[PDB]
C-alpha cells in the first residue's frame, strides 16, 4: 500500500495555527512524488536531513500542512522569539523533523486559495484580578491554546478576541489577536514532517 499524499492537493489549506495533520502508518511512501509537484523554496531539518527523510523506514510519518507566505520565512527563523513558534506552530523537540516552504504552481488549481494569510500574534490569560496577562504559548507538536477563539481566517489585521473562563477554571479571560498578510499571486504553503523510529516496526518505508 502506497501512502497517499493526495489530501494536500485538494481543497483550501488551513492557516498555520489550524495546520492539518496527516498520520501515516503501514504504508510505503514516495516523498519526491509529492515535492516534485511544487516549487520548493526552503527545506530545513532537525536531527535528520532532506536526503535521509526521503529514504528511511519509520514506525510513523506525520505530515502537517498549511497556507504560509514565503515573506514570513524569517518569522520562522526567530523561533520562540516570534509569534509563529510562540502561538501558532512549533514542531516536536523529541523526534526528527523537517519544515518545507513551497509555492503552488499554476497547474495545481485543485488547491484553492484562502482570502489572505492569517496568524495569531497574541494568546494570553487575563487573570481574575483583571490586571496581569500571562501569555499562553503552544507546546511542541500541539495546537495553540487559543485555536478555539481565533477564526479560521482573520477578518481584519489586528482583530482581537476574548472568552470568559468559568470560576472553576480560575476566572478571568482567554484573549488573543490575529494578523493578516495579503494573498500572493500563487499560493504559498508550509509542509511539516515529523518521523518516529518506534517500538512498533518501521513499516513506513520508501517505495522502491
Amino acid at each position: 500500500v502506497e501512502c497517499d499524499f493526495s489530501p494536500l492537493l485538494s481543497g483550501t489549506p488551513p492557516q498555520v495555527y489550524n495546520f492539518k495533520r496527516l498520520v501515516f502508518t503501514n504504508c510505503n511512501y514516495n516523498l519526491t512524488k509529492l515535492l516534485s509537484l511544487f516549487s520548493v523554496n526552503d527545506f530545513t531539518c532537525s536531527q535528520i536531513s532532506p536526503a535521509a527523510i526521503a529514504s528511511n523506514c519509520y514506525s510513523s510519518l506525520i505530515l502537517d500542512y498549511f497556507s504560509y507566505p514565503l515573506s514570513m520565512k524569517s518569522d520562522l527563523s526567530v523561533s520562540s522569539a516570534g509569534p509563529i513558534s510562540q502561538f501558532n506552530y512549533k514542531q516536536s523537540f523529541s523526534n526528527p523533523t523537517c519544515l518545507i516552504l513551497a509555492t503552488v504552481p499554476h497547474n495545481l488549481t485543485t488547491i484553492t486559495k484562502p482570502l489572505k494569510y492569517s496568524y495569531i500574534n497574541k494568546c494570553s490569560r487575563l487573570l481574575s484580578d483583571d490586571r496581569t496577562e500571562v501569555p499562553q504559548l503552544v507546546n511542541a507538536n500541539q495546537y495553540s491554546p487559543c485555536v478555539s477563539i481565533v477564526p479560521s481566517t482573520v477578518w481584519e489585521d489586528g482583530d482581537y478576541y476574548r472568552k470568559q473562563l468559568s470560576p472553576l477554571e480560575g476566572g478571568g479571560w482567554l484573549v488573543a489577536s490575529g494578523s493578516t498578510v495579503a494573498m500572493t499571486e500563487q499560493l504559498q504553503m508550509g509542509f511539516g514532517i515529523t518521523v518516529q523510529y518506534g517500538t512498533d516496526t518501521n513499516s513506513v518505508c520508501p517505495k522502491l
Epitope: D4, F5, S6, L9, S10, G11, K33, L34, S36, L37, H106, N107, L108, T109, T110, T112
Partner: nanobody
Amino acid sequence: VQLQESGGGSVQAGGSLTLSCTFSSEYTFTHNAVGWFRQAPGKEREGVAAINGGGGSTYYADSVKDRFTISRDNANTVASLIMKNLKPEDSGIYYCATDVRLIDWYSGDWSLARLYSTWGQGTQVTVSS
C-alpha cells in the same frame, strides 16, 4: 446517480461531436478531476483526455491530440469533450470518471482507469466511413 454522459451519436468520418459529462446538482470536481475514457470491442478501456477542477492541468492521449479538446465550466460541474475530424476507430462507448487519486493523476498516470472511483454509464459514439 452522480455522473451522466451525453452528446454521443452517429456521425460520418471527418465530422464532429461534443460530449458532456454533467455532475449531479450537489457534486463538483472543483478539488478533483475528470477523465474521459472510451471502450471499443476487443480493446482495453482507453483514456483520451482529462482535466482538473480549475482547469490548470489538461492531458490528452497521443491518438487524439490536435483533434480533441476537453474543457470545464467555471463551477466545475460539466466537463466537455469537443471531438473533431472523427475516424471509424474513434467509435466506442465513452465514459467520464471522477474521484481520482490526485497525486498519481498529476504524476503521469491520468489515463489509468483504476485510479478513478466514480464512473458514468457511458454514451455511444458511432463513426461511419
